[PDB]
């Protein structure tokens, strides 16, 4: 279990609106990395997922032996432990168990989540190029693995209702899932088949960020038309790219009890990887901007239960125009107009301030994370702190040109020294060992 210095500083809004204005990033602190490195030049470690909770943390990432492309073989590294203070005062993520799922099953796009006494991981089994998954009417196999700290492992092949013949594909969003009211929730996305109820109920729906108008040159009518079309991809088997949540009851005999809950396309953008968070009793969702809007997307999710079962989800977006992401073509970090896009990067963000603390939801929100500072390339990884309109603190890592990919940010407070530490897990392109080196950078978020 985590040290007494952290058990009460996890999953919360750490600063008041007033304090968010005077926040800044401290120097990077040096701790023993708890994320394993490749031991060959071409070894590839990518797609991390990290979950932290009151009692412990869970970590995982995919390992491919040669290069980063392979749809036949890969192993999945899983790790878990606690946080404890060092004599310098800052955190040390102590690993208490390690696992390396290496058995021939190609588990991909895995999302992990802390659960009482262990970790629950959700993956899909890849047997062909991603694009082929969207064309095949059959969805990939889905699996959720529970790894207890007592070393018991239970893996199940799940078949949630409304997936077969509805979704051509279904993937975990790779971002962490969360344990909420006895259920484990995972972010999901994929492509829905034309003519299905979902498709029909989703018909004519679209979402446009509050701050697009002022920045977009097209008129309202044109925007609405392009927005509606951005949810359908001809390149990906002509499917409606949908975002959603997978809810699984915490059981060791899961089969078809997990529920697929898709977001209304009236509240969310085109489906993409994502991450679920927990701030107090509130669930939040991060959605990768793989569509036309290149800015960070965060939503407060309201979950409805009917007979003790999640029955519907509603998402309220925190309006911002800050922290863009590198895209391709007419969907670079400079784009502001609706249209169909299918490019981007995963770069979640952590809210240091409560969006509900302002009379108008998210009118003044502060968040932190990392982003690739460039219009179209995955270059210049930069850690930052920002509000809805501007970046108020930032520090690029390495020299310009430095390649990087995804970034997962998590913050917690030391209730002992009363300081907030954030960990920025960034996939860095390395020249020495392996294609990438997933690094858990850690630094303090100073008030002043």
Ligand X SMILES: *[C@@H]1O[C@H](CO)[C@@H](O[C@@H]2O[C@H](CO)[C@@H](O)[C@H](O)[C@H]2NC(C)=O)[C@H](O)[C@H]1NC(C)=O
What are the residues binding its own copies (CB under 8 A)? 3-9, 28-40, 42-43, 45, 63, 65-66, 72-73, 75, 77, 81, 84-89, 92, 94-100, 102-106, 125, 127, 398, 413-418, 428, 430-434, 437, 439-442
8 A C-beta contact, residue 232 and residue 240: yes
215, β-bridge pairs: none
**Residue 70 binding ligand NAG, by CB under 6 A:** no
Among 1, 4, 22, 125, binds ligand NAG (CB under 6 A): 22
8 A C-beta contact, residue 402 and residue 72: no
Nearer to its own copies, 116 or 201 (CB): 116
Closest CA to 68 of 432, 429, 370: 429
Q: Whole-angstrom Cα distance, residue 84 to residue 58?
A: 15
8 A C-beta contact, residue 385 and residue 25: yes
**Of ligand NAG, ligand X, Ca ion, none, which one does residue 136 interact with (CB within 5 to 8 Å by kind)?**
Ca ion
How many CA atoms lie within 13 Å of 366's alpha carbon, on the beta-carbon side? 23
Nearer to ligand X, 6 or 14 (CB): 14
8 A C-beta contact, residue 423 and residue 368: no
**Of Ca ion, its own copies, ligand NAG, none, which one does residue 19 interact with (CB within 5 to 8 Å by kind)?**
ligand NAG
Among 3, 7, 12, 19, binds ligand NAG (CB under 6 A): 19
* Residue 330: both structure tokens together: 């007419």
Minimum Å distance from CB 18 to ligand NAG? 5
Q: Which residues in this chain contact ligand X in the complex, by CB under 6 A?
A: 117, 148, 150, 152, 364, 387-390, 392
Nearer to its own copies, 155 or 257 (CB): 155
8 A C-beta contact, residue 430 and residue 404: no
Nearer to Ca ion, 20 or 191 (CB): 191
391, β-bridge pairs: 386
Q: Whole-angstrom Cα distance, residue 293 to residue 313?
A: 22
**Residue 18 binding ligand NAG, by CB under 6 A:** yes
Minimum Å distance from CB 413 to ligand NAG? 16
**Of its own copies, ligand NAG, ligand X, none, which one does residue 162 interact with (CB within 5 to 8 Å by kind)?**
none
Taking CB atoms within 8 Å and a gap of at least 24, the contacts of 152-158 are 153/99, 154/252, 156/252, 156/253, 156/254, 156/255, 158/248, 158/254, 158/255, 158/256, 158/258
Closest CA to 355 of 11, 4, 2, 16: 16
Minimum Å distance from CB 80 to its own copies? 11
**Of ligand NAG, Ca ion, ligand X, none, which one does residue 153 interact with (CB within 5 to 8 Å by kind)?**
none
Whole-Å CA distances, 344 to 39, 148, 239, 405: 29, 35, 19, 10
Q: Whole-angstrom Cα distance, residue 201 to residue 445?
A: 44
Q: Whole-angstrom Cα distance, residue 118 to residue 123?
A: 17
Nearer to ligand X, 19 or 364 (CB): 364
**Residue 169 binding Ca ion, by CB under 5 A:** yes
Minimum Å distance from CB 78 to its own copies? 10
Q: Whole-angstrom Cα distance, residue 179 to residue 196?
A: 30
How many residues sit in the footprint of Ca ion (CB under 5 A)? 4
Nearer to Ca ion, 136 or 402 (CB): 136
Q: Which stretch binds Ca ion (CB under 5 A): 153-161, 169-177, 385-393, 440-448?
A: 169-177
Nearer to ligand X, 179 or 199 (CB): 179
Nearer to Ca ion, 158 or 211 (CB): 158
Minimum Å distance from CB 17 to ligand NAG? 10
Nearer to ligand NAG, 16 or 302 (CB): 16
367, β-bridge pairs: 351, 386
8 A C-beta contact, residue 423 and residue 407: no
Which residues form the interface with ligand NAG (CB under 6 A)?
Answer: 18-19, 22
Which residues form the interface with Ca ion (CB under 5 A)?
Answer: 133, 136, 168-169
């Amino acid at each position: 279990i985590n040290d007494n210095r952290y058990i009460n500083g996890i999953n919360q809004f750490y600063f008041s609106i007033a304090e968010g204005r005077n926040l800044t990033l401290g120097p990077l602190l040096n701790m023993p990395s708890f994320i394993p490195t490749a031991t060959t030049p071409e070894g590839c470690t990518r797609i991390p997922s990290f979950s932290l909770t009151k009692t412990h943390w869970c970590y995982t990432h995919n390992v491919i032996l040669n290069g980063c492309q392979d749809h036949v073989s890969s192993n999945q590294f899983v790790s878990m432990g606690i946080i404890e203070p060092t004599s310098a005062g800052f955190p040390f993520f102590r690993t208490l168990k390690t696992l390396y799922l290496s058995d021939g099953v190609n588990r991909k796009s895995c999302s992990i989540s802390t659960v009482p006494g262990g970790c629950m991981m959700y993956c899909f089994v890849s047997t062909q190029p991603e694009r082929d998954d969207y064309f095949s009417a059959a969805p990939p196999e889905q699996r959720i693995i529970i790894m207890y700290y007592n070393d018991t492992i239970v893996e199940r092949i799940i078949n949630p209702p409304g997936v077969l013949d509805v979704w051509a594909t279904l993937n975990p969003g790779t971002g962490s899932g969360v344990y909420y009211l006895g259920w484990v929730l995972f972010p999901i996305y994929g492509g829905v088949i034309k003519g299905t109820s979902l498709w029909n109920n989703q018909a004519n729906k679209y979402f446009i960020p509050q701050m697009v108008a002022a920045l977009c040159s097209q008129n309202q009518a044109t925007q609405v038309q392009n927005a509606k079309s951005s949810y359908y991809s001809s390149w990906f088997g002509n499917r409606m790219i949908q975002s959603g949540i997978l809810a699984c009851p915490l059981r060791q005999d899961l089969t078809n009890e997990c529920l697929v809950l898709p977001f209304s396309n009236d509240q969310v953008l085109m489906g993409a990887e994502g991450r679920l968070y927990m701030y107090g009793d509130s669930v939040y969702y991060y959605q990768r901007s793989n569509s036309w809007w290149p800015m960070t997307m965060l939503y407060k999710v309201t979950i409805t239960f009917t007979n003790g079962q999640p029955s519907a989800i509603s998402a309220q977006n925190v309006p911002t125009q800050q922290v863009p992401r590198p895209g391709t073509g007419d969907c670079s970090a400079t784009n502001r107009c609706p249209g169909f896009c299918l490019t981007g990067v995963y770069a979640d963000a952590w809210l240091l301030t409560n969006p509900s603390s302002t009379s108008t939801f998210g009118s003044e929100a502060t968040f932190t994370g990392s982003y690739l500072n460039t219009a179209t390339q995955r270059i210049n990884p930069t850690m930052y702190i920002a509000n809805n309109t501007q970046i108020i603190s930032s520090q690029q890592f390495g020299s310009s040109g430095q390649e990087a990919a995804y970034g997962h940010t998590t913050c917690f407070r030391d209730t002992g020294s009363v300081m907030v530490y954030c960990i920025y897990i960034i996939e860095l392109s390395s020249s020495l060992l392996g294609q990438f080196q997933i690094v858990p950078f850690i630094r303090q978020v100073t008030l002043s």
